[PDB]
Coordinates of C-alpha atoms and ligand atoms in Angstrom, one line a residue:
Chain A
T33 CA -6.6 -13.8 -22.6
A34 CA -6.7 -10.0 -23.5
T35 CA -9.2 -8.1 -21.4
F36 CA -10.9 -4.7 -21.4
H37 CA -11.3 -2.4 -18.4
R38 CA -12.9 1.0 -17.8
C39 CA -13.5 3.2 -14.8
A40 CA -16.3 2.0 -12.5
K41 CA -17.0 5.6 -11.6
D42 CA -18.8 6.4 -14.8
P43 CA -18.4 10.3 -14.6
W44 CA -14.6 9.9 -14.4
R45 CA -14.4 7.9 -17.7
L46 CA -12.8 9.5 -20.8
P47 CA -14.2 7.4 -23.7
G48 CA -12.4 7.6 -27.0
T49 CA -8.8 7.2 -25.7
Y50 CA -7.4 3.8 -24.7
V51 CA -4.3 2.6 -23.0
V52 CA -3.2 -0.6 -24.8
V53 CA -1.1 -2.6 -22.4
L54 CA 1.1 -5.3 -23.9
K55 CA 2.6 -8.3 -22.1
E56 CA 5.5 -7.7 -19.8
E57 CA 8.5 -8.7 -22.0
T58 CA 7.1 -7.0 -25.2
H59 CA 9.8 -4.9 -26.8
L60 CA 9.4 -1.3 -27.9
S61 CA 9.8 -2.3 -31.6
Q62 CA 7.0 -4.8 -31.1
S63 CA 4.8 -2.1 -29.4
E64 CA 5.3 0.3 -32.3
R65 CA 4.6 -2.4 -34.8
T66 CA 1.4 -3.3 -32.9
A67 CA 0.3 0.3 -32.9
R68 CA 0.8 0.5 -36.6
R69 CA -1.0 -2.7 -37.2
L70 CA -4.0 -1.3 -35.2
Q71 CA -4.0 1.9 -37.2
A72 CA -3.8 -0.1 -40.5
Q73 CA -6.6 -2.5 -39.5
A74 CA -8.7 0.4 -38.3
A75 CA -8.1 2.4 -41.5
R76 CA -9.3 -0.6 -43.5
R77 CA -12.5 -0.5 -41.5
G78 CA -12.9 3.2 -42.2
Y79 CA -11.7 4.4 -38.8
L80 CA -9.3 7.2 -38.0
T81 CA -6.9 6.5 -35.2
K82 CA -4.2 8.5 -33.5
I83 CA -1.3 7.0 -31.5
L84 CA -0.7 9.6 -28.9
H85 CA 2.2 7.9 -27.1
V86 CA 4.1 4.6 -27.2
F87 CA 4.9 3.4 -23.7
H88 CA 8.2 1.9 -22.9
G89 CA 10.2 1.8 -19.7
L90 CA 7.6 0.8 -17.2
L91 CA 4.8 -0.9 -19.1
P92 CA 5.0 -1.6 -22.8
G93 CA 2.0 -0.4 -24.9
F94 CA 0.6 2.7 -26.4
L95 CA -2.0 5.3 -25.9
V96 CA -4.5 5.5 -28.8
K97 CA -7.4 7.9 -29.7
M98 CA -9.9 5.8 -31.5
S99 CA -13.5 4.7 -31.4
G100 CA -14.3 2.1 -28.9
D101 CA -15.9 0.2 -31.8
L102 CA -12.3 -1.0 -32.5
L103 CA -11.8 -2.6 -29.1
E104 CA -12.7 -6.2 -30.1
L105 CA -10.2 -5.8 -33.0
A106 CA -7.6 -4.3 -30.6
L107 CA -7.9 -7.0 -28.1
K108 CA -7.0 -9.5 -30.9
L109 CA -3.7 -7.7 -31.6
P110 CA -0.5 -9.6 -30.9
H111 CA 1.1 -9.0 -27.5
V112 CA -2.0 -7.5 -25.9
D113 CA -2.4 -8.0 -22.2
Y114 CA -5.3 -5.7 -21.6
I115 CA -6.8 -2.4 -22.7
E116 CA -8.0 0.3 -20.4
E117 CA -10.2 3.3 -21.3
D118 CA -8.6 6.5 -20.1
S119 CA -10.1 8.2 -17.1
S120 CA -9.8 11.2 -14.8
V121 CA -7.7 11.7 -11.7
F122 CA -8.0 14.6 -9.3
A123 CA -5.9 16.6 -6.9
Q124 CA -6.4 15.4 -3.3
Chain B
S1 CA 5.0 29.1 16.4
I2 CA 6.1 25.7 14.9
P3 CA 3.2 24.7 12.7
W4 CA 1.3 21.9 14.6
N5 CA 1.9 19.4 11.8
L6 CA 5.6 19.8 11.9
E7 CA 5.5 19.4 15.7
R8 CA 3.3 16.3 15.4
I9 CA 5.9 14.5 13.3
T10 CA 8.7 15.5 15.5
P11 CA 9.8 12.5 17.6
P12 CA 10.2 12.4 21.4
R13 CA 13.9 12.6 21.0
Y14 CA 15.7 14.7 18.4
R15 CA 18.8 16.5 17.3
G24 CA 17.4 17.1 5.6
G25 CA 16.6 14.8 2.6
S26 CA 19.5 16.0 0.3
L27 CA 20.9 12.7 -1.1
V28 CA 17.3 12.0 -2.0
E29 CA 15.2 13.5 -4.8
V30 CA 11.4 13.9 -4.5
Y31 CA 9.4 14.0 -7.7
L32 CA 6.0 15.7 -7.6
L33 CA 3.3 14.9 -10.1
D34 CA 0.8 17.7 -9.6
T35 CA -0.4 21.0 -10.9
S36 CA 2.0 23.6 -12.1
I37 CA 4.0 25.2 -9.3
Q38 CA 5.2 28.7 -8.5
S39 CA 8.9 27.7 -8.5
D40 CA 10.2 31.1 -7.4
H41 CA 8.3 31.1 -4.1
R42 CA 10.8 31.6 -1.4
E43 CA 10.0 28.4 0.5
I44 CA 11.1 26.4 -2.5
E45 CA 13.1 28.7 -4.8
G46 CA 16.3 26.9 -5.9
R47 CA 15.2 23.6 -4.4
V48 CA 12.4 22.7 -6.9
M49 CA 13.3 22.1 -10.5
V50 CA 10.3 22.4 -12.9
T51 CA 10.8 19.7 -15.5
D52 CA 8.3 21.4 -17.8
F53 CA 6.8 17.9 -18.4
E54 CA 3.2 18.6 -18.9
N55 CA 0.3 16.3 -19.8
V56 CA -3.0 17.6 -18.7
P57 CA -6.6 17.5 -20.0
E58 CA -8.2 20.8 -21.2
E59 CA -9.9 22.9 -18.5
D60 CA -13.7 22.3 -18.3
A68 CA -2.0 31.5 -12.4
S69 CA -2.1 31.9 -8.7
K70 CA -5.1 29.5 -8.7
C71 CA -3.5 27.1 -11.3
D72 CA -0.4 26.5 -9.2
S73 CA -2.0 26.6 -5.8
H74 CA -2.1 22.8 -5.0
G75 CA 1.3 21.9 -6.3
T76 CA 3.1 25.0 -4.8
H77 CA 1.6 24.2 -1.4
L78 CA 2.7 20.6 -1.5
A79 CA 6.3 21.3 -2.7
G80 CA 6.4 23.6 0.3
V81 CA 5.1 20.9 2.7
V82 CA 7.7 18.5 1.3
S83 CA 10.7 20.8 1.1
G84 CA 9.8 24.4 2.2
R85 CA 12.6 26.4 3.8
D86 CA 10.4 27.5 6.7
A87 CA 7.4 25.1 6.8
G88 CA 8.7 22.0 5.1
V89 CA 9.3 18.5 6.4
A90 CA 12.5 17.7 4.6
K91 CA 13.6 21.3 4.5
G92 CA 16.6 20.2 2.5
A93 CA 15.3 18.3 -0.1
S94 CA 15.6 18.6 -3.8
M95 CA 12.4 18.3 -5.8
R96 CA 11.5 17.9 -9.5
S97 CA 8.0 18.7 -10.6
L98 CA 5.9 17.3 -13.4
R99 CA 2.6 18.8 -14.4
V100 CA -0.1 16.2 -14.7
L101 CA -2.9 18.3 -13.2
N102 CA -4.6 21.1 -14.9
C103 CA -5.7 24.5 -13.4
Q104 CA -8.7 22.9 -12.0
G105 CA -6.7 20.0 -10.4
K106 CA -7.8 17.5 -13.0
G107 CA -5.6 15.0 -14.8
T108 CA -5.8 11.8 -16.7
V109 CA -4.6 8.2 -16.0
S110 CA -2.7 8.4 -19.3
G111 CA -1.0 11.7 -18.4
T112 CA 0.0 10.2 -15.0
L113 CA 1.4 7.0 -16.7
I114 CA 3.4 9.2 -19.1
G115 CA 4.6 11.2 -16.1
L116 CA 5.7 8.1 -14.2
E117 CA 7.4 6.8 -17.3
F118 CA 9.2 10.2 -17.7
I119 CA 10.6 9.8 -14.2
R120 CA 11.9 6.3 -15.0
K121 CA 13.5 7.5 -18.2
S122 CA 15.1 10.5 -16.5
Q123 CA 16.6 8.1 -13.9
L124 CA 18.0 5.8 -16.6
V125 CA 19.6 8.6 -18.4
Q126 CA 21.0 10.3 -15.3
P127 CA 21.0 8.0 -12.3
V128 CA 21.0 9.7 -8.9
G129 CA 20.3 8.3 -5.4
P130 CA 17.0 7.2 -3.8
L131 CA 13.9 8.6 -5.4
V132 CA 10.6 9.4 -3.8
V133 CA 7.6 10.1 -6.0
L134 CA 4.7 11.9 -4.6
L135 CA 1.4 11.3 -6.3
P136 CA -1.0 13.8 -4.5
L137 CA -3.9 12.6 -6.7
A138 CA -6.6 9.9 -7.1
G139 CA -9.1 8.4 -9.5
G140 CA -11.0 5.2 -9.3
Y141 CA -9.4 1.9 -9.2
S142 CA -7.1 1.6 -12.3
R143 CA -5.4 -1.6 -13.3
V144 CA -2.9 0.2 -15.5
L145 CA -2.1 2.9 -13.1
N146 CA -1.6 0.4 -10.3
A147 CA 0.5 -1.7 -12.6
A148 CA 2.7 1.2 -13.5
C149 CA 3.2 2.1 -9.9
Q150 CA 4.1 -1.5 -9.0
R151 CA 6.6 -1.6 -11.9
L152 CA 8.1 1.7 -10.8
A153 CA 8.2 0.4 -7.2
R154 CA 9.9 -2.8 -8.3
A155 CA 12.4 -0.7 -10.2
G156 CA 13.4 0.6 -6.8
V157 CA 11.6 4.0 -6.6
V158 CA 9.6 4.8 -3.5
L159 CA 6.0 6.0 -4.2
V160 CA 3.8 7.9 -1.8
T161 CA 0.2 8.7 -2.7
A162 CA -2.8 10.3 -1.2
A163 CA -5.5 7.9 0.2
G164 CA -8.2 10.0 -1.4
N165 CA -10.7 12.6 0.0
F166 CA -13.9 10.5 -0.5
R167 CA -14.5 9.2 3.0
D168 CA -14.4 5.8 1.4
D169 CA -12.4 2.7 1.1
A170 CA -9.0 3.6 -0.4
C171 CA -8.9 0.2 -2.2
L172 CA -11.5 1.6 -4.6
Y173 CA -9.1 4.3 -5.7
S174 CA -5.8 4.6 -7.5
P175 CA -2.9 5.0 -7.0
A176 CA -4.1 4.6 -3.4
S177 CA -4.9 0.9 -3.9
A178 CA -1.5 -0.2 -5.4
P179 CA 0.1 -2.3 -2.6
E180 CA 3.7 -1.2 -3.4
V181 CA 2.7 2.5 -3.0
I182 CA 2.7 4.1 0.4
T183 CA -0.8 5.3 0.8
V184 CA -1.5 8.1 3.3
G185 CA -4.7 9.2 5.0
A186 CA -5.1 12.6 6.7
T187 CA -5.5 13.3 10.4
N188 CA -6.0 16.6 12.2
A189 CA -4.5 18.3 15.2
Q190 CA -6.5 16.1 17.4
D191 CA -5.2 13.0 15.6
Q192 CA -8.6 12.3 14.3
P193 CA -9.5 11.6 10.6
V194 CA -9.9 14.7 8.6
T195 CA -13.5 15.8 7.4
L196 CA -13.4 17.6 4.1
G197 CA -16.9 19.0 3.6
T198 CA -19.3 16.2 3.5
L199 CA -16.5 13.8 2.8
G200 CA -13.0 13.3 4.2
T201 CA -10.0 11.1 4.3
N202 CA -10.3 7.6 2.9
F203 CA -9.5 4.7 5.1
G204 CA -9.3 0.9 5.0
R205 CA -6.7 -1.7 4.4
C206 CA -5.0 0.0 1.4
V207 CA -4.1 2.9 3.7
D208 CA -0.6 2.4 5.2
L209 CA -0.7 5.2 7.7
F210 CA -2.1 8.6 8.4
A211 CA -0.3 11.9 8.6
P212 CA -1.1 15.6 9.3
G213 CA -3.6 16.8 6.6
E214 CA -5.8 19.5 8.1
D215 CA -4.8 23.2 8.4
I216 CA -1.4 22.5 7.0
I217 CA 0.5 25.8 6.5
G218 CA 2.7 26.0 3.4
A219 CA 3.7 28.1 0.4
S220 CA 0.9 30.0 -1.3
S221 CA 1.2 30.8 -5.0
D222 CA -0.6 34.1 -4.3
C223 CA 2.7 35.7 -3.7
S224 CA 6.3 34.6 -3.4
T225 CA 6.4 35.0 0.4
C226 CA 2.7 34.2 1.2
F227 CA 1.4 31.2 3.0
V228 CA -1.9 29.4 3.0
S229 CA -3.4 26.5 5.1
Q230 CA -4.7 23.6 3.1
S231 CA -6.3 20.3 4.0
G232 CA -6.4 16.9 2.3
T233 CA -4.8 13.6 2.0
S234 CA -2.4 15.2 -0.6
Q235 CA -1.0 17.3 2.3
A236 CA -0.8 14.1 4.4
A237 CA 1.0 12.3 1.7
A238 CA 3.5 15.2 1.4
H239 CA 4.4 14.7 5.0
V240 CA 5.1 11.1 4.4
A241 CA 7.1 11.9 1.2
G242 CA 9.2 14.3 3.4
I243 CA 9.6 11.7 6.2
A244 CA 10.6 9.1 3.6
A245 CA 13.2 11.5 2.1
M246 CA 14.6 12.1 5.5
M247 CA 14.7 8.4 6.4
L248 CA 16.3 7.6 3.1
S249 CA 18.9 10.3 3.4
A250 CA 19.9 8.7 6.8
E251 CA 19.7 5.1 5.6
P252 CA 20.0 5.2 1.8
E253 CA 20.1 1.5 1.3
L254 CA 16.6 0.9 2.8
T255 CA 14.5 -1.4 0.7
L256 CA 10.8 -0.4 0.3
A257 CA 9.9 -3.0 2.8
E258 CA 12.5 -1.7 5.3
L259 CA 11.2 1.8 4.8
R260 CA 7.6 0.8 5.2
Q261 CA 8.4 -1.1 8.4
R262 CA 10.2 2.0 9.8
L263 CA 7.3 4.3 8.8
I264 CA 5.0 2.0 10.7
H265 CA 7.4 1.5 13.6
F266 CA 8.1 5.2 14.2
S267 CA 4.4 6.2 13.9
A268 CA 2.2 7.3 16.8
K269 CA 0.0 4.3 17.5
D270 CA -3.6 4.0 18.6
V271 CA -4.3 7.7 18.7
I272 CA -7.1 7.8 16.1
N273 CA -10.7 7.2 17.4
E274 CA -11.8 4.6 15.0
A275 CA -15.5 5.4 15.6
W276 CA -15.2 7.9 12.8
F277 CA -14.7 5.0 10.3
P278 CA -17.4 2.7 9.1
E279 CA -17.6 -0.3 11.4
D280 CA -16.2 -2.9 9.1
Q281 CA -13.2 -0.6 8.2
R282 CA -12.0 -0.1 11.8
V283 CA -10.1 -3.4 11.9
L284 CA -8.7 -2.9 8.4
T285 CA -7.6 0.7 9.0
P286 CA -4.1 1.2 10.5
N287 CA -4.2 3.3 13.6
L288 CA -1.0 5.1 12.9
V289 CA 0.1 8.7 12.6
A290 CA 3.4 9.3 10.8
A291 CA 6.5 10.6 12.6
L292 CA 10.1 11.1 12.0
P293 CA 12.5 8.6 13.5
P294 CA 14.0 9.7 16.8
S295 CA 17.7 10.5 17.0
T296 CA 17.8 7.6 19.6
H297 CA 17.8 5.4 16.5
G300 CA 21.7 -2.0 16.7
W301 CA 19.3 -4.5 15.2
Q302 CA 15.5 -4.7 16.1
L303 CA 12.7 -7.0 15.0
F304 CA 10.2 -5.1 12.8
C305 CA 6.9 -6.8 11.9
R306 CA 3.8 -5.6 10.2
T307 CA 0.3 -7.0 9.7
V308 CA -0.8 -7.4 6.0
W309 CA -4.5 -7.9 5.5
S310 CA -5.5 -9.5 2.1
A311 CA -8.2 -8.6 -0.1
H312 CA -11.4 -10.2 1.1
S313 CA -11.7 -13.6 -0.7
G314 CA -15.3 -13.1 -1.8
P315 CA -18.1 -15.7 -1.2
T316 CA -17.1 -18.5 -3.5
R317 CA -17.2 -21.8 -1.6
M318 CA -13.6 -22.6 -2.4
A319 CA -12.5 -19.0 -2.1
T320 CA -9.1 -18.3 -0.7
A321 CA -7.6 -15.0 0.4
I322 CA -3.8 -14.6 0.1
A323 CA -1.7 -12.2 2.2
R324 CA 1.9 -11.9 1.1
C325 CA 5.1 -10.4 2.4
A326 CA 7.7 -8.4 0.6
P327 CA 10.5 -10.4 -1.0
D328 CA 12.9 -9.4 1.8
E329 CA 10.4 -10.2 4.6
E330 CA 9.6 -13.4 6.4
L331 CA 6.1 -14.5 7.0
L332 CA 6.2 -15.3 10.8
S333 CA 2.5 -16.1 11.2
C334 CA -0.8 -16.2 9.5
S335 CA -4.3 -15.6 10.8
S336 CA -7.7 -15.0 9.3
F337 CA -11.0 -13.3 10.1
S338 CA -14.5 -13.2 8.9
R339 CA -17.2 -11.0 10.3
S340 CA -19.7 -14.0 10.2
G341 CA -17.2 -16.4 11.6
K342 CA -17.9 -18.7 8.6
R343 CA -14.3 -19.7 8.1
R344 CA -12.2 -22.8 7.3
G345 CA -9.1 -21.1 8.8
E346 CA -5.8 -20.5 7.2
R347 CA -2.5 -22.0 6.3
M348 CA 1.0 -20.9 5.5
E349 CA 1.8 -22.4 2.1
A350 CA 4.9 -21.9 -0.1
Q351 CA 4.6 -20.2 -3.4
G352 CA 7.3 -19.2 -5.9
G353 CA 9.7 -20.4 -3.2
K354 CA 8.3 -18.0 -0.6
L355 CA 5.7 -18.6 2.1
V356 CA 2.3 -16.8 1.9
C357 CA -0.7 -16.8 4.2
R358 CA -3.7 -18.4 2.6
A359 CA -7.2 -18.3 4.2
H360 CA -10.1 -20.4 3.3
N361 CA -13.8 -19.5 3.2
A362 CA -16.5 -21.7 4.6
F363 CA -19.5 -23.0 2.8
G364 CA -22.0 -20.2 2.9
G365 CA -19.4 -17.8 4.2
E366 CA -19.4 -14.3 2.7
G367 CA -15.6 -14.6 2.5
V368 CA -12.6 -14.2 4.7
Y369 CA -9.4 -12.3 5.1
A370 CA -5.9 -13.7 5.3
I371 CA -3.8 -11.8 7.8
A372 CA 0.0 -12.1 7.5
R373 CA 2.6 -11.1 10.0
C374 CA 5.5 -10.1 7.8
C375 CA 8.8 -9.3 9.6
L376 CA 12.3 -8.2 8.7
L377 CA 14.5 -11.1 10.0
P378 CA 17.8 -11.4 8.3
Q379 CA 19.8 -14.7 8.8
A380 CA 16.5 -16.4 9.6
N381 CA 15.9 -19.9 8.2
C382 CA 12.1 -20.3 8.5
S383 CA 9.9 -23.3 7.6
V384 CA 6.4 -24.6 8.2
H385 CA 5.6 -27.8 10.0
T386 CA 2.2 -29.2 9.2
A387 CA 0.1 -31.9 10.7
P388 CA -3.3 -33.1 9.3
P389 CA -6.3 -33.6 11.5
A390 CA -5.5 -36.1 14.3
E391 CA -9.2 -36.9 14.6
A392 CA -8.9 -37.9 18.2
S393 CA -8.5 -36.7 21.8
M394 CA -5.6 -34.3 22.4
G395 CA -6.3 -32.1 19.3
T396 CA -4.0 -31.8 16.3
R397 CA -0.5 -30.9 17.3
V398 CA 2.8 -30.1 15.6
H399 CA 6.0 -28.7 17.0
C400 CA 9.3 -27.2 15.9
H401 CA 11.4 -30.3 16.7
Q402 CA 14.8 -29.2 15.6
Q403 CA 17.3 -28.0 18.3
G404 CA 17.4 -24.2 18.5
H405 CA 14.4 -23.5 16.2
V406 CA 11.7 -21.1 17.6
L407 CA 8.0 -21.2 17.0
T408 CA 6.9 -17.8 15.7
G409 CA 3.3 -18.6 14.6
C410 CA 0.5 -21.1 14.7
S411 CA -2.2 -21.5 12.0
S412 CA -5.0 -24.1 11.5
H413 CA -7.3 -24.8 8.7
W414 CA -10.1 -27.4 8.4
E415 CA -12.0 -29.0 5.5
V416 CA -15.1 -30.0 7.6
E417 CA -18.3 -28.0 7.5
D418 CA -18.2 -27.7 11.3
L419 CA -16.6 -29.0 14.5
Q432 CA 4.6 -27.0 25.7
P433 CA 7.5 -25.1 23.9
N434 CA 7.4 -24.7 20.2
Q435 CA 4.1 -26.6 19.9
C436 CA 0.9 -25.5 18.1
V437 CA -2.4 -27.2 19.0
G438 CA -5.5 -27.2 16.9
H439 CA -8.9 -28.8 16.9
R440 CA -8.9 -32.6 16.3
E441 CA -10.6 -32.2 12.9
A442 CA -8.3 -29.4 11.8
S443 CA -4.8 -29.3 10.3
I444 CA -2.2 -27.4 12.3
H445 CA 0.7 -25.4 11.0
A446 CA 3.7 -24.1 12.9
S447 CA 6.1 -21.5 11.6
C448 CA 9.5 -22.6 12.9
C449 CA 12.6 -20.4 12.4
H450 CA 16.2 -20.8 13.1
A451 CA 17.0 -17.3 14.2
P452 CA 19.8 -17.6 16.7
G453 CA 19.7 -13.9 17.7
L454 CA 16.0 -14.3 18.5
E455 CA 14.3 -14.9 21.8
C456 CA 10.5 -15.6 21.9
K457 CA 8.0 -16.0 24.7
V458 CA 4.2 -16.8 24.7
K459 CA 1.8 -14.7 26.6
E460 CA -1.8 -15.9 27.0
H461 CA -5.0 -14.3 28.2
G462 CA -8.5 -15.6 28.4
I463 CA -11.9 -14.5 29.7
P464 CA -15.7 -15.5 29.8
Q467 CA -17.2 -11.7 25.3
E468 CA -16.7 -10.0 21.9
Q469 CA -12.9 -9.5 21.9
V470 CA -10.1 -10.7 24.0
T471 CA -6.7 -9.1 23.9
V472 CA -3.1 -9.7 24.9
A473 CA -0.1 -7.5 24.4
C474 CA 3.6 -8.2 24.2
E475 CA 5.8 -6.4 26.6
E476 CA 7.5 -3.2 25.5
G477 CA 10.5 -3.9 23.4
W478 CA 9.1 -7.2 22.2
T479 CA 7.6 -7.7 18.7
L480 CA 4.4 -9.7 18.3
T481 CA 5.1 -12.4 15.6
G482 CA 2.0 -14.5 16.0
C483 CA -1.5 -14.1 17.3
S484 CA -4.1 -16.9 17.6
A485 CA -7.0 -18.1 19.7
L486 CA -6.7 -21.3 21.8
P487 CA -9.1 -23.9 20.2
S490 CA -16.1 -20.0 21.9
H491 CA -16.9 -19.4 18.2
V492 CA -14.1 -17.1 17.1
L493 CA -14.5 -14.8 14.1
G494 CA -10.8 -14.6 13.9
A495 CA -7.6 -13.2 15.3
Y496 CA -5.2 -10.5 14.3
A497 CA -2.2 -8.6 15.5
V498 CA -2.7 -4.9 16.0
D499 CA 0.8 -3.5 16.4
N500 CA 2.1 -5.7 19.3
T501 CA -1.4 -6.6 20.6
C502 CA -3.0 -9.9 19.7
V503 CA -6.8 -9.5 19.2
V504 CA -9.2 -12.5 19.2
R505 CA -12.7 -11.8 18.0
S506 CA -15.7 -14.0 18.9
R507 CA -19.5 -13.9 18.7
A519 CA -13.5 -19.1 28.2
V520 CA -12.0 -17.6 25.0
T521 CA -8.2 -17.2 25.0
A522 CA -5.8 -15.0 23.1
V523 CA -2.3 -16.2 22.6
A524 CA 0.6 -14.0 21.5
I525 CA 4.0 -15.1 20.5
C526 CA 6.4 -12.3 21.2
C527 CA 10.0 -12.1 20.1
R528 CA 13.0 -9.8 20.2
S529 CA 16.7 -9.5 19.3
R530 CA 18.8 -11.3 21.9
Ligands
LIG1 C1 20.4 -20.9 7.1 O1 20.7 -21.8 6.1 C2 21.8 -21.4 5.3 C3 22.0 -22.3 4.1 O2 22.1 -23.7 4.5 C4 23.1 -21.3 6.1 O3 24.1 -20.6 5.4 C5 22.9 -20.6 7.5 O4 23.8 -21.1 8.4 C6 21.5 -20.8 8.1 N1 21.2 -19.8 9.1 C7 20.6 -20.2 10.3 C8 20.5 -19.1 11.3 O5 20.2 -21.3 10.5
LIG2 CA1 -0.9 1.2 -0.3

């Protein structure tokens, strides 16, 4: 059931950084472990990753700088609800 | 001498914001400007993408001044805290914004204060995660106000504009018309909650600590509503989001925007409301609002769902399609709460479900349904219990084509009555019919429209606009159920 989303306004997309959103009741410890699992699974495939931030308090998840190549792998992680490619917002 | 915008939001009778804190997620700000000096705390939270000082803090400084400025602010009071999620060019990221929203929530948990208003004077395209974060923060009891967007487009295509729990604000000018911004302008449509002054808005200029600049945009509009919310919440701190939203709608100037400015299909979806502060003149009153669903899309069995807030009652349910290819609507229970569900017809492009959601404490409301009679007097159902009032009639059908407290439908249609025991409530029914693209009937002043329907020649749909029931067709008769506190 884990899905991927990116900005429909193609110019506003910021490929290479992804917000990994985990299911609602996921605990911070589980989010951190999921991030580590991703980095390990990535490293085994020859990919560098960087966990920029671990979300807790509103949504559980993490922000990760990685190749989009890893998205199929990432979508199979435990607890994943969806993954969204980062994108741009602008002063109105 | 009063800036036009501050006069515009001043009510017809009058005599702030200090118990409330307004968070700003924006560019950096000039916090020593005299409009805001000592009232804005810079958190020094910063999460901004690389570019690609007077200029850097122009947007944020102006908006802090619109919200809380000593001389030109709305909530001249109020305390603000600023987070930097926009770079010098006014560009941010969804992730930085999420991290910012999260920071606000963590700050609150560590050091709880009173009501919080969060102003998000920014937009990107539709974002599931940003909308979800907003919803979660709204559900956590924080009030969020965002800019509709400056793209002269449907705000539902943008975030946070499109998040239903966020108060989304479009921009109107001194003539109460939607603001043009170059070749674009204020967004519109059903994700916009209301409009507010957003052209030629004077406020703090980060050029110098006593300078002022006029700016235009839906951010400026949103700042007015953040200010109004802060004032309203200082006065009535216990307001739920739904109570605050109903007040913002109720105290707005109504039917002052020329809707010709909007694309034709967005006119009906776009609220014709310009924000204002509550009058000093204000016991209990019946507040209702019209909630349009997302369009169901064209699937044959497509349904659109319009829901109310947890603390609201669904008093009626209508539907609308521009084609008129429609299987009507029904009020159905769902997670122990009634929702308005509309059904598309075979070959229909889709339909909207249109709920009337009202703040009615001590109400016990139910739905009484009857299936197609298939004969003679039409399909009928009534609120049979002693003392229950009918607040709304709905009807749906499954076919491809065709007296107090009673609803009447087509003989081949099911009929649904919303029946409430609301002993403080008086309701009357006002009808009007004519030979015709649109027929219209309004409740009397001081009465609140709870239900709007067409007597069962090919109607596209019916919908409440404020306290006016509109029936759309391609003698047709509009029927309004109007109620008030007794
Ligand atoms: C609504 O029902 C509840 C629970 O039975 C009851 O306490 C209350 O008297 C009812 N209110 C009205 C106005 O019927
Ligand atoms: Ca909204």
